[PDB]
Write a protein that binds this DNA or RNA. Structure first.
Ligand SMILES: NC(=[NH2+])NCCCO
Lengths: 215, 209
DNA sequence: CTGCCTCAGGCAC
DNA sequence: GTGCCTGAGGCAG
C-alpha cells in the first residue's frame, strides 16, 4: 500500500537516472526529520539541494514555513555543515537504489573467476595450497558473519520504523552509519563484500578443479 | 588536460550548493562510452553529458562527435545494460568512490562492530582459532585489494602502461567500463570498513589477553 | 520515446 | 549567502 500522503513531504527526481528511467522518489517527513537532526543537522539551503528545489527569492523562508506546518522547526540561522559528501546529496530511495545497482554490478560484472585464477597463480607452490585453502575458508566465514550483522540493521528508512532485532548499543552505531550515508552505507559495504565472496568461491573452486583445468 | 582533448565540461550530479567545479569529459572518455561493452547512443550519451533534450539534439551531438573523429550512427539502439552508475562522468565516479572510502574510514563503527562480534565468540578455548581466522581474513582481503590497486584501465585523458598481464587487465577494464571507473575503487573503499573491523577485533582480543 | 516549456541550479555578486 | 535567468530535463503526450 501507498505511503499515507500526510506523511510524504515531497517527491524528488533521481540525480543519477538517464532518460526518465525512475519515478520521482517520495521523501517522507521521517526522512526530512533524519536530515534536520544529529548527526548531520542540515540547514534550509542544504536541505533545499537534497530536495532539488529552485533557489527562488525567499526560497529558505518558504521551505522553513513548509517544515513548520508539519511540526519540524528549522532555525533560519542554523550553521551550514562543512562535512558534506557526495552521498549527502541523495534522497534515501536513490541512495538505496544506488547500493542495489552496486550489488547488481558486483554480482554480474565483477570478474571474480579471472581474479581468483590470477591470485591463485601468485600463491601456487604445492607447499602453500593447504594453508591458502584454509585462509580462503576462514575469510568466507568471517566476511559472512560481518555481512550477517549488517543485514540485521533495522535503521528507520522511508516510512518504516521496524522493531530492532539487535541490542540498542550496536543498533545506534549502525544507525549512525545509515544517517551519514542516507541509507547507502551498510548495503554498499554488503554489495562490495559479495564481489570478495564470489572471488573466494571461485578461488576455492579453481583449486578443487585444478586437475581438470590443466586436463 | 589539453583543450583539444576536452569534449565538454559537465556539472556533477551529486554536488550540493556549487561545492565542485564542472568535470572535464575528454574525447577518450566519450570514445569509451561509444565502444563495447556499453555502446551508448546519442540519447544516453546526451544524458551522461547533461545536455538539453532539444529537437534533433541527437543530430547536433552526432555532428559534434564526427568533427572530433568519433562515428555515432543515428540508428544505434539503446544499451542493453544501464544502471545508475551509467549516468556518471569518470571524474565524478572516481570522486564518489573516494567519498565512499572516506565515509568507510571516518564513520563506519568498526570498534563497536568488533566488540559485538568478539562477544559472540567468548568461549576461552576458541580465541586462538578466532584470532587466526581474523588474521587470515586481513591478509586475503589485502592481496585482493592490492590486485585491484594495480588496475591501469584508461580513465580521463590517462593511458598508463599496464603493470598486470593483458588477460587480468582486460577483465578489470571490463568492470571499469560498465562502472565508469567507480567499481574497483568502491570495492576497495568497502573493504576498508572490513579491514578496520578486523583491526579493532584483533586489538580488543589482545587487550582482553 | 520525443522534445517543449517549467523550474533546478550554475553562476555573479 | 542570495536569488536571477540560462538551459537541463521532467513531464506531457
Ligand atoms: N554537521 C554539522 N554538525 N554541521 C553544523 C550543523 C548546524 O548546527
Amino acid at each position: 500500500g501507498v505511503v499515507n500522503p500526510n506523511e510524504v513531504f515531497c517527491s524528488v527526481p533521481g540525480r543519477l537516472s538517464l532518460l526518465s528511467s525512475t519515478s520521482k522518489y517520495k521523501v517522507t517527513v521521517a526522512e526530512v526529520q533524519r536530515r534536520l537532526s544529529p548527526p548531520e543537522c542540515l540547514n534550509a539551503s542544504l536541505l533545499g539541494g537534497v530536495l532539488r528545489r529552485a533557489k527562488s527569492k525567499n526560497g529558505g523562508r518558504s521551505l522553513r514555513e513548509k517544515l513548520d506546518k508539519i511540526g519540524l522547526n528549522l532555525p533560519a540561522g542554523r550553521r551550514k555543515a562543512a562535512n558534506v559528501t557526495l552521498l549527502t546529496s541523495l534522497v534515501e530511495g536513490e541512495a538505496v537504489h544506488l547500493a542495489r545497482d552496486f550489488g547488481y554490478v558486483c554480482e554480474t560484472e565483477f570478474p571474480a573467476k579471472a581474479v581468483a585464477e590470477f591470485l591463485n597463480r601468485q600463491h601456487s607452490d604445492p607447499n602453500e595450497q593447504v594453508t591458502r585453502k584454509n585462509m580462503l575458508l576462514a575469510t568466507k566465514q568471517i566476511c559472512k558473519e560481518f555481512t550477517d550483522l549488517l543485514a540485521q540493521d533495522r535503521s528507520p528508512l522511508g516510512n518504516s520504523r521496524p522493531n530492532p532485532i539487535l541490542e540498542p548499543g550496536i543498533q545506534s552505531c549502525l544507525t549512525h552509519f545509515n544517517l551519514i550515508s542516507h541509507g547507502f552505507g551498510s548495503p554498499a559495504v554488503c554489495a562490495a563484500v559479495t564481489a570478495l565472496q564470489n572471488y573466494l568461491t571461485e578461488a576455492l573452486k579453481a583449486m578443487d578443479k585444478m586437475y581438470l583445468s590443466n586436463n
